[PDB]
């Protein structure tokens, strides 16, 4: 089967700048009728894929002409002349010249924006949960940029690595930021044996770790 190689894997571009994605094939995509069946698709976050280009350079209806396609043989390029927020998503090249049809691995386009420091919120276990014998401490690190962040949990000054569950959202199409959730789950008994619970983050926007904590006690 034809192997389709796309590069780069991810590109970060500021709104207003140009972008270009490459797609290489293991066989020429020139069909015996002289047509080259190479398509480009865009899959926006949480949406089905959509064809942008067909026959190497022909734009599908309703597709902005900021998008351009070119190439031949085994080398193809998709270029966006001026990036806009709506261009966020994963781009794929797919060939139809050789059966079976094969796709490239995709290129994630991410919007490069000004660095943003996380807004951190920490939440102790709910009464409801403690009643069941469990206790989760939740920490939200909302709207930061770049995506690269490291969070550690500390209980009474020592790092706790076991029982942590992290989740990140994709880049927000409203402000181009990221958000992440970190949950530390313990037994009700151990939860009630400690005092301070700290959610600590390491991010580009600060020379020292970003901190949020609470001391559980009574009254």
């Amino acid at each position: 089967d034809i192997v389709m190689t796309q590069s780069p894997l991810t590109l970060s571009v500021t709104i207003g700048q140009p972008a270009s994605i490459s797609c290489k094939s293991s066989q020429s995509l020139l069909y015996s009728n002289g047509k080259t069946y190479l398509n480009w698709l865009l899959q926006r976050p949480g949406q089905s894929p959509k064809r942008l280009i067909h026959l190497v350079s022909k734009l599908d209806s309703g597709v902005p002409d900021r998008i351009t396609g070119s190439g031949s043989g085994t080398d193809f390029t998709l270029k966006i002349s001026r990036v806009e927020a709506a261009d966020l998503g994963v781009y794929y090249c797919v060939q139809g010249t050789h059966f079976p049809y094969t796709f490239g691995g995709g290129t994630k386009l991410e919007i490069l924006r000004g660095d943003a420091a996380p807004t951190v919120s920490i939440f102790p276990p709910s009464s409801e949960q403690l009643t069941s014998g469990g206790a989760s401490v939740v920490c939200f690190l909302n709207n930061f940029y770049p995506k690269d962040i490291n969070v550690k949990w500390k209980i009474d000054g020592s790092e706790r690595q076991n029982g942590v569950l992290n989740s990140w959202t994709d880049q927000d199409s409203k402000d181009s930021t990221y958000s992440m959730s970190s949950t530390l789950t313990l037994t009700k008994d151990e939860y009630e044996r400690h005092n301070s619970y700290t959610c600590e983050a390491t991010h580009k926007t600060s020379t020292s770790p970003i901190v949020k904590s609470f001391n559980r006690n009574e009254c």
């Binding site: 909302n142 989740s167 959730s181």
Partner: protein, 222 residues
């Protein structure tokens, strides 16, 4: 308005089979090829097969012969894809699409896609979630704006539906992708409002887990 509606998420036991449906409308069903595409773990697409409903003619990617069987009910404008003897690699999202390539014209008409059908191959048991309200103590963000949360934990399988104030409150909402651990998923959502809204006016977390027919609303009380 051309539309393709696919069936809901499926939890299938290993070794069994499923029949996925793709209901279309807005165009002449028998005159266009319908293709099925598979997507695993995010970016990673594969072409499965195509059927021309008018004649019932089909073409399969070798890899899927014996795995997928495509049919189409002209009387209802519905295409179907049966997946047989499911195993690990079959867990994925499947899309149907009126791709739009017209062989005779050697050109294309617009592609319309279904929303996708998630198939989970597992023998793990269906479990209802526990919804926990997250009121701030330190997650207050001082005055100005306060952020609340909702923790949905210990459920199986995906998906779960979470809205705030029945969908009324959609801005400043962050719902995180569920994470699987020990055969159960955990999901959380945060909502940021002004100090003026909460606690003055109520904020409620709405959660639904179709697989276990669970529907619960948790009011974030201070």
């Amino acid at each position: 308005e051309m539309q393709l509606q696919q069936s809901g998420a499926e939890l299938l036991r290993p070794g069994t089979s499923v029949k996925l449906s793709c209901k279309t409308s807005g165009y002449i069903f028998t005159s266009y090829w319908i293709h099925w595409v598979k997507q695993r773990s995010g970016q990673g697409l594969e072409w499965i097969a195509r059927i021309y409903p008018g004649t019932g003619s089909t073409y399969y990617n070798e890899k899927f012969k014996g795995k997928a069987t495509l049919t189409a009910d002209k009387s209802s404008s519905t295409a179907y894809m049966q997946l047989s003897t499911l195993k690990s690699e079959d867990s994925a999202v499947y899309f149907c699409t009126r791709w739009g390539f017209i062989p005779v014209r050697e050109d294309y008409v617009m592609d319309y896609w279904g929303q996708g059908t998630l198939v989970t191959v597992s023998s793990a048991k269906t479990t209802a979630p526990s919804v926990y309200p997250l009121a701030p103590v330190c997650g207050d963000t001082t005055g100005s704006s306060v952020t609340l949360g909702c923790l949905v934990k210990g459920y199986f399988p995906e998906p779960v539906t979470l809205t705030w104030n029945s969908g009324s409150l959609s801005s400043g909402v962050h719902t995180f992708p569920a994470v699987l651990q020990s055969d159960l998923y955990t999901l959380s959502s945060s909502v940021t409002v002004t100090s003026s809204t909460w606690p003055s006016q109520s904020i409620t977390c709405n959660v639904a887990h179709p697989a276990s027919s669970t529907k619960v609303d948790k009011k974030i009380e201070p």
